[PDB]
Amino acid sequence: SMAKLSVSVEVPLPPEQAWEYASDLSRYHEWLSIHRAWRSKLPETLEKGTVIESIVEVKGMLNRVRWTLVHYKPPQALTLNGDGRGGVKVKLIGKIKPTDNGATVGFDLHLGGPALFGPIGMVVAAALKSDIQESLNRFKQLYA
């Protein structure tokens, strides 16, 4: 078990559209502020077990992360495990749910591994809360 942060946005989009945009990895660089590089070729189709590598920046720190799709259920849920260099271990639970006026796109992000159990974890957690929320706001601005 690990501590976690939670972020969400409501978009004026039906869930199937919100899913299409949220899983369009080729456009993450237009709204995900922490993304810095892809380090493996992006697949045409995602599936449970898909593995992708990227480099992210959080509060000025770079980290190369291997992402594994451990749950994949369009158009409503995905879970991604991340193993970063230096002892970073994260789990990203994504959920897309229909609402009255569109759909919510929210994430629970568990932050762990030795690196984030240590004193830097609350720095990283606070920075990620802001960065991911701002990114979701950009997602909404770009796609809706």
Residue numbers in the entry: 0 to 143
Q: Which text from the study accompanies this structure?
A:
Meromycolate extension acyl carrier protein (AcpM) serves as the carrier of fatty acyl chain shuttling among the individual FAS-II components during the progression of fatty acid elongation. In this study, MSMEG_5634 in Mycobacterium smegmatis was identified as a novel acyl-AcpM-binding protein. MSMEG_5634 and its homologous proteins are highly conserved among mycobacteria and belong to the SRPBCC (START/RHOs_alpha_C/PITPs/Bet v1/CoxG/CalC) superfamily, containing a START domain that functions as a lipid-binding domain involved in eukaryotic signal transduction as well as a cyclase/aromatase domain for the biosynthesis of polyketide antibiotics in Actinomycetes. MSMEG_5634 can transport acyl-AcpM away from FAS-II by forming the MSMEG_5634/acyl-AcpM complex and contributes to intrinsic sensitivity to FAS-II inhibitors.
The structure of MSMEG_5634 was solved at 1.9 Å resolution. MSMEG_5634 has a helix-grip structure that contains seven-stranded antiparallel β-sheets (named β1 to β7) and four α-helices (α1 to α4). α1 and α2 are two short consecutive helices located between β1 and β2, and α3 is also a short α-helix which is followed by the long C-terminal helix α4. The seven-stranded antiparallel β-sheets and the long C-terminal α-helix α4 together fold into a barrel, with a deep hydrophobic pocket wrapped in the middle of the barrel. The first two short helices α1 and α2 fold into a V-shaped structure that seals the bottom of the pocket. A clear linear electron density was observed inserted into the pocket of MSMEG_5634, which might be a chain of a fatty acid based on its shape, indicating that MSMEG_5634 may bind fatty acid chain-containing substrate. In the refined structure of the MSMEG_5634 protein expressed and purified from E. coli, there was a linear electron density, which might be a chain of fatty acid inserted into the pocket of MSMEG_5634. The overall structure of MSMEG_5634 is similar to that of the TcmN polyketide cyclase/aromatase domain but with differences in the conformation of proposed active site residues. According to the protein sequence and structure, the corresponding residues of MSMEG_5634 are Tyr-27, Arg-63, -65, and -84, but the side chains of Arg-63, -65, and -84 all point to the outside of the pocket. Third, the ligand-binding pocket of MSMEG_5634 is more hydrophobic than the pocket of TcmN ARO/CYC. The interaction between MSMEG_5634 and acyl-AcpM was disrupted by the substitution mutation of W30A in helix α2, which formed a helix–loop–helix motif together with the α1 helix at the bottom of the pocket.
